[PDB]
Symmetry: C4
Subunit: 388 residues, 4 copies
């Protein structure tokens, strides 16, 4: 086996096709399905799998009560076969904790989990299913990371972490790992003013991460990483097509180097593919809550502060609950280009559906097509009343 | 590994022996068995597996309510080990959608799933467990395909699709795939007037598909495909032994090039093995409903419009519910001939058994023997009353 | 891989040690454990597994009602990992039917299942998980076979079948298979007057089978098979230590060439290891019913009509229900001898425990030691009251 | 494959990081999780797994009633994937019995289980999943062994056994196995006065075991084994930091060659890493009961009868139930040193929580870091009230 190199460009994105869907909440009404949240997708050279943070209980289990909670000792990063639900019997534990990332470098997989109390959390870096390196909290305020896959080039796998305030300046670091060992880290540079939950993908240009500004911005910060030089830059998506949630209405001029104002101290993990005229942005349909999901083709969104959509695709109707979303690609697929993919977390239960005492989710996932495919919409599909 | 070539003839069929049976509905009364329909069987070079369209819920789950429905977002093609039931914990998702086919070419498996609304459906073609090609609806009216396995020769795997009316002329296409890529497609030619749900098998003569005419015919249309030239012909089974359901009583003269009249706008997926004096036809015993199943040896059924049975075998008693049936063979078995096999879907629940609110099925499967074996009958075996 | 040859003698048997136990009925009180009966054990070159005939329902499932029944369409030979219980999710179906045998030849496994009505049953012979040969009933009266493993030498695997009366002369045949194909069969010869459910093992001397005479005998018939010449002889165990059930009390003179009288038209599957001074016989402790199990060292039991025990070991107390028992060995273990092993079926439910409506079992298994080990007793361990 | 040699020293232990946690009792409230106790962890060259003694029933099963019991016929050593819970469907049975050890030698795994009545117990030694050797009780009083992993060097795997009184002088033996065969055994020598449940680890210095004195001592006995010479010595941890439970308060002078007095006829399995200035001891926080767990850095604890802690880490709060603890390491990890690891059994149910009728546990596990990591605490996390 050899380390994977990012040698291809993105395939032309003309629409999105269904890739995976687990119907976890439907099935979990009567099966031993683990309560999860913060899911993602990540590929090995021979298999692609679903990932999420378990809550250490099934949905029907009485311990599902209180699972709106973010950071218990009962959480772990688990993975399971593509489009199956996360069950007690099919889920593989990657590491223990309440914030994670994971990626395959072509030879083996690195997984990182953070655990601990708010003022004393630590990351453990696993490589080829063994713990290799550990990182202590540097700001003593909820050390946290991507909640979707990292990306590797020639064995080097950059990861974005943040430690510090969720509502003011924080201490963000980019770490560069190889075989689970720390090669280097650096403090965030550039014009992004707050960074959380980066969604990343790689292509010949380098590694691109679209993150969330939880503090003041409703445009998304972007970190661009060179995995060879092990350096990065940051800014915001310039486009006035705003993609955080909640968010103001779309103006006609966006902001490249500062948060677009209107909504403070909140946000949702999201993603984009920034590729000149082949640029597509994901966002919730609602500007107020985590409901609906759509993709919008916004040429040069990264650099053009006047850019608007010229094409789109609804993924989840506004009437249906969405949640976190993030990027991944099958770096080991055949062909001359990397096919852009993404997942959407479909959150069920609390806080929006409070007749149940749990919070969980299912997953839907799409990849790009060079065809102009007809669109459907993809709800979680569970009926809350059945759980009462 | 090499691509499989269709180098053998069919084994002489003198009777049928039990091959597989999953008892899924019996077991699912108290186990996490997924609700399915439209099942089939398909072999890899090292394993044969059961396939079906899941409904994204177990039978005992409250979401089983309403599963008579054909095309939800919660359906997926799943596969699972031969004669095991389709459980949450043992089922592998091949792709997402509500109409499917799948086949191994000797090197890897191609699976195709169609999803979408009626007017905007699309096929995604997967090869070696990755999405490779996509096909948009061409008639905007329920793009649909075989619901049983396709067949490959030297890497070329033909698949029959239909888009358009179920009750009038429609747009049927034969696609030719290799490694999931589209080599060619062509519009239906020949005398078949309506084509749905083709059941196919291969042998040195080429690929033979027995389909369903949903519009006017109660004889079955046949498509014969040359996978090297990538061309086909079509007609009907000439025999007056009629094999659709519902259907008129058997006359003494059949129809080779037009639908045999009497029953309109309905039908069931079925199959035959058309091999001169070694010809066997499957059909429901009832002419009115999907109940019973029998095999009948009808020499030269394809070409002889006077042909009648000379031997037969009951598979399912008329007192028991049947359903879809289709062909498959183990192309990788030892020996000098291909052993003909088939499955019968045993539908339980709605619409025929409406005291439950679900629709599901189990599977029984047979292969041919050169012996003249004694016959049994093979019911689903579940007691509906237990589910109340 | 090479075919296994029977090149070793039996290890000296000085006691028996615990080998496996699945506690299936205990666990099945609250888990998806399949109802079974007629279990056995059989080894591959890399793994040993438990085998049994499923009834196509779990114990807690409502379809467990009526499982005292021997021969439904819902039965199948399943296998599962050593000492695990037979669950819906871990059981591999080998073939469909209600009477079976199975054995590995060193390269692949042959499994045989018989299915059908009483007057029209048939065997299907599977090799390397594919159907290869079929055998129709020859006497039209419940074609039936060993219900424990067969044994192979240089690719030749003999199997004993019986078709015909259970209460008078029947038609017993010994078949010789290689790669699932029929090399030869022959009618029973020798002095055994009725043969059912042979338990077999192999060693340099050939293949030895201890069977059951269901008609008149309470001593056990023995068939000795030469797998090279493909010939056999038969007689009874000469010893007055009688080992069928039910049975008369032990006399002082046994019978070598005729049934020992007293009990007609009943019996239980059993086994022995016949090895001169290293001979050990298994039997139920009760002479009236299937309760208890003990091993007795009876020198030259096969040939000495006065032979009595000189050592023994209780396996199951008389207070606890037993059932079928049979022989197997790990032919692929290291060392200079084959270690004798056996299983005992521990039947729970009907007819003896009729407060439940089901019949099932668990398994306990022992192998021999050259040590003189202390003895325990090994009950099924389930409490019937829990199932009410 | 080659036998592993103990060529490395221990990594410097500056703190402990989370390694694994199964949340078994939480999950088992609504899933088919087996009741266990006496768990441990052990690595193969390609995977690390959790181990424990099953009770042959799930927690929700009615047979969980009475599982405080130590030695039934329904117990077995099982293993299952790291941090998954021990379920009916994912647990692999290693051998049958109620006292165990297991270890991989670099080529294959040896597992040992003891079963039998108190006066007639016996060990069966399994190697590469086959029974190889057996050892009869020598003192006829509950033959028993480590309840955590053994350690191997160049194919030789020492194991400590005890047979005889729990409350007076007993007969302890050290056995030396290779490929499951007995090379040698010897009677305990040295100054340790009573030995049970040794927790062992290996490094270039040899094999170090920290055991329990059940008779008079609240300091822990230590056995140091040379796996090449196949000889050993014994004494006690000299440190006045006492680590058994229950135990007296810590004095200022410990005892090197005799039990430290105050508590008789009780104890708990525990462990330490004895490595000069890199020495760390584990213990319950409570001196009265199995509650809490902490690690304490006690330089030269083995040899210094005045030694006190200079650093520590809380693992489980005193408010939470703990239980057995033991050592293991991944001998096949990359790097220049062996990373010390340990598990803590978190016992739930009887005798401390008697509103339920069962006794079970979950597992938490840590390994060492060269960083000074922030500490969390790791409770079982189940709510007993949910089980009522
Ligand atoms: C079968 O399936 C197919 C395939 O999926 C279906 O076809 C798809 O249909 C959907 C739905 O219509 C389309 O999505 C929309 O796309 C438009 C963009 O395309 C339009 O505009 C293009 C740009 O035009 C401008 O520039 C060009 C320069 O060339 C210039 O020519 C033009 O004059 C103008 O200046 C046009 O080029 C384009 O035309 C082309 O395509 C047509 C087909 O679509 C075709 O007929 C033409 O011939 C030509 O080829 C077309 O006119 C997106 O604008 C739109 O997204 C907006 O609207 C949705 C609601 O529908 C909303 O959710 C989005 O967020 C967005 O609107 C919000 O944001 C805007 C930007 O800030 C803002 O301006 C809006 O006011 C709005 O903002 C408000 O809401 C948001 C969200 O809550 C909030 O945040 C804000 O604050 C505020 O409150 C859709 O994405 C697909 O593109 C189309 N696909 C294809 C391949 O055709 C087909 O319908 C299905 N068939 C059936 C029968 O069902
Ligand atoms: C143990 O197991 C074994 C193995 O399974 C069992 O043996 C099997 O027994 C079954 C049941 O009998 C047989 O199936 C039937 O086969 C017959 C065909 O064979 C008969 O006819 C042959 C043809 O004869 C004609 O041509 C020859 C030319 O050679 C000429 O000689 C003759 O005069 C005549 O002109 C004969 O050759 C054949 O004889 C041979 O075999 C005999 C044994 O079967 C043997 O004894 C002889 O010596 C000789 O060797 C034999 O006579 C099928 O016709 C029949 O199928 C029809 O009937 C069933 C109901 O039973 C029905 O469901 C079928 O659909 C079909 O009838 C419908 O369709 C017809 C065609 O259109 C129509 O004409 C009918 O009116 C009817 O139509 C109505 O119903 C349908 C369905 O609902 C509806 O759609 C219509 O609209 C309409 O309403 C059976 O398949 C097996 O072949 C046989 N197997 C073997 C190897 O023997 C054995 O019984 C078991 N033992 C025990 C104790 O249980
Ligand atoms: C810790 O574990 C160890 C290891 O397991 C335990 O030790 C074991 O203890 C058990 C139980 O006692 C033993 O099993 C019994 O073995 C005897 C056979 O051994 C005895 O007889 C031998 C033969 O003696 C004859 O020939 C010799 C020639 O050398 C001659 O010297 C002698 O005079 C006589 O002529 C003796 O050699 C042997 O002595 C040796 O071993 C002794 C230890 O056992 C030792 O102390 C001596 O020093 C010497 O070394 C010994 O005396 C079996 O006969 C017996 O089986 C019968 O009884 C059981 C009930 O207990 C019954 O279930 C059996 O079916 C059988 O009895 C039935 O069948 C008979 C034959 O037809 C019949 O005659 C009986 O009347 C009876 O028939 C009735 O019941 C059956 C069944 O329902 C029914 O079908 C009939 O119709 C009828 O109704 C046991 O198998 C183990 O051998 C022994 N193992 C070892 C290694 O020691 C130890 O106890 C445990 N410790 C503790 C504290 O628990
Ligand atoms: C974020 O996470 C980090 C990392 O985990 C947290 O930092 C950790 O904090 C914990 C809790 O405080 C520390 O654990 C304790 O460690 C001390 C040992 O360190 C102290 O003592 C050292 C030795 O000093 C002596 O020798 C030196 C020689 O150099 C000499 O200088 C000195 O004068 C004295 O003579 C000091 O070196 C050390 O200082 C160093 O570290 C400091 C930080 O800790 C730092 O600030 C300094 O600058 C310097 O660098 C420090 O003073 C353990 O003693 C202690 O364990 C005892 O207490 C706990 C309860 O807390 C108890 O459970 C233990 O069993 C034990 O006490 C029992 O046993 C004793 C021995 O017999 C006995 O004397 C006690 O009376 C007591 O006995 C009673 O209870 C037991 C148990 O029930 C019973 O059996 C008996 O019978 C009896 O009833 C803790 O382990 C970590 O070391 C520390 N880690 C690090 C890297 O800093 C941080 O707090 C977190 N942040 C936040 C905000 O939460
Ligand atoms: C604390 O809230 C953070 C994250 O919030 C989100 C969410 O659904 O909004 C869930 C994450 N939950 C988990 N990863 N478990 C939180 N992140 C953490 C570390 O709690 C937020 O981005 C502000 O810093
Ligand atoms: C019919 O009874 C036969 C077998 O009886 C036994 C039993 O528990 O006694 C179960 C077998 N059940 C199964 N193998 N399924 C039967 N054997 C058969 C073929 O029914 C008997 O040996 C007489 O011929
Ligand atoms: C009998 O008690 C012994 C062991 O006690 C412990 C315990 O939780 O205290 C459980 C073990 N349970 C199991 N290993 N099953 C016992 N050990 C045995 C062999 O029962 C003790 O160390 C005195 O000899
Ligand atoms: Ca924001
Ligand atoms: Ca029709
Ligand atoms: Ca008898
Ligand atoms: Ca003690």
């Amino acid at each position: 086996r050899n380390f994977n190199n990012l040698t291809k460009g993105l395939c032309t994105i003309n629409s999105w096709h269904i890739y995976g869907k687990d119907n976890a909440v439907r099935i979990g009404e009567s099966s031993d399905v683990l309560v999860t949240r913060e899911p993602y997708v990540s590929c090995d050279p021979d298999e692609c799998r679903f990932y999420a943070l378990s809550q250490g209980t099934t949905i029907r289990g009485k311990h599902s009560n209180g699972t709106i909670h973010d950071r218990s000792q009962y959480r772990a990063l688990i993975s399971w076969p593509l489009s199956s639900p996360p069950t007690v019997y099919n889920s593989r534990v990657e590491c223990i904790g309440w914030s994670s990332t994971s990626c395959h470098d072509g030879k083996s997989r690195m997984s990182i989990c953070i655990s601990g109390p708010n003022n004393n959390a630590s990351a453990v870096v696993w490589y080829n299913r063994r713990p290799v390196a550990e990182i202590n909290t540097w700001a003593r305020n909820i050390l946290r990371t991507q909640e979707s896959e990292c990306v590797c080039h020639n064995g080097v796998c950059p990861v974005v972490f943040t430690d510090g305030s969720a509502t003011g300046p924080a201490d963000t670091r980019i770490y560069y790992f190889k075989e689970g060992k720390i090669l280097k880290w650096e403090s965030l540079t550039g014009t992004a003013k707050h960074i959380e939950e980066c969604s990343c993908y790689g292509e010949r240009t380098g590694i691109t991460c679209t993150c969330k500004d939880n503090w003041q911005g409703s445009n998304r910060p972007v970190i661009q990483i060179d995995p060879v030089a092990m350096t990065h830059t940051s800014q915001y998506i310039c486009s006035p097509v705003l993609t955080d949630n909640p968010r103001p209405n779309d103006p006609n001029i966006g902001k490249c180097n500062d948060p677009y104002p209107g909504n403070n101290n909140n946000g949702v993990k999201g993603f984009s593919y920034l590729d000149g005229a082949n640029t597509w942005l994901g966002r919730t349909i609602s500007t107020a809550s985590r409901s609906g999901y759509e993709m919008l083709k916004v040429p040069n969104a990264l650099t053009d502060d006047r850019s608007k959509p010229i094409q789109g695709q609804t993924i989840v109707l506004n009437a249906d609950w969405s949640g976190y979303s993030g990027s991944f690609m099958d770096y080991w697929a055949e062909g001359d280009c990397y096919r852009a993919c993404f997942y959407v977390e479909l959150i069920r239960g609390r806080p929006k559906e409070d007749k149940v005492w749990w919070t969980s989710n299912s997953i839907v996932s799409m990849c790009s097509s060079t065809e102009f495919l007809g669109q459907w919409n993809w709800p979680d599909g569970a009926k809350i009343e059945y759980f009462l």
